[PDB]
């Protein structure tokens, strides 16, 4: 599914993302926007290490989820990557929280660094009632 902006902000807020690890809801929204376009079915294949990025937060199959076809798989989230291609985003939200647990935090996502880091992100939560 493709979430509408405010629909997603309210869902992310209900799932405890706002201020999670010092990360504002607006920053999480910006990440989702540039990673997938708020799309739970987004996928991206990386020919270099043969990994795939999955779902709304584009979680990678090498370190975080198991897709069963990626070399050097760690499965740090202990989740099948297919669980991150679902309309219900609880698993995706939890795995995104696991990514930011690491020292790098939300800087792990290159797109967040190129589009959201040091960017006014007020528009992502404006008028959503969050």
């Amino acid at each position, epitope marked *: 599914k493709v979430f509408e902006r405010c629909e997603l902000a309210r869902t992310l807020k209900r799932l405890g993302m706002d201020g999670y690890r010092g990360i504002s809801l607006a920053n999480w929204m910006c990440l989702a926007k540039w990673e997938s376009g708020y799309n739970t079915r987004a996928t991206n294949y990386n020919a270099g290490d043969r990994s795939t990025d999955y779902g709304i937060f584009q979680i990678n199959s090498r370190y975080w989820c198991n897709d069963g076809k990626t070399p050097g798989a760690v499965n740090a989230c*202990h989740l099948s990557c297919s669980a991150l291609l679902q309309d219900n985003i*609880a698993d995706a939200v939890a795995c995104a929280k696991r990514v930011v647990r690491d020292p790098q935090g939300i800087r792990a996502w290159v797109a967040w660094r190129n589009r959201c880091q040091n960017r006014d992100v007020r528009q992502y939560v404006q008028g959503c009632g969050v």
Partner: nanobody
Amino acid sequence: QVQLQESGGGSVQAGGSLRLSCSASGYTYISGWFRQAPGKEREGVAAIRSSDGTTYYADSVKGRFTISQDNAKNTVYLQMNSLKPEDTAMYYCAATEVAGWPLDIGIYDYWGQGTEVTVSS
């Protein structure tokens, strides 16, 4: 964040059953029970992932202990059947918002105060 409160601890005779409860004041993804027997290091017992209801048990209690959830009351339960003297311990409820191996102590961020379970004879 999330505060956890356990209850149901008590003294039971060997072979008996006991059910512990744990309430959470906010949303949790994974919840589990970690016990500390007298003089020993704390160890994992059982865990549950709330999204799909999958459950994970330590080899020492697998088959005997079962963990469940009541999503309406936001509570988790640890049912223990066929208790042994060796199950005597302070049982702690813990939770996290992160996805990881549910019996990995390192992913847990929220901890209760513990509820004592004593198994005699």
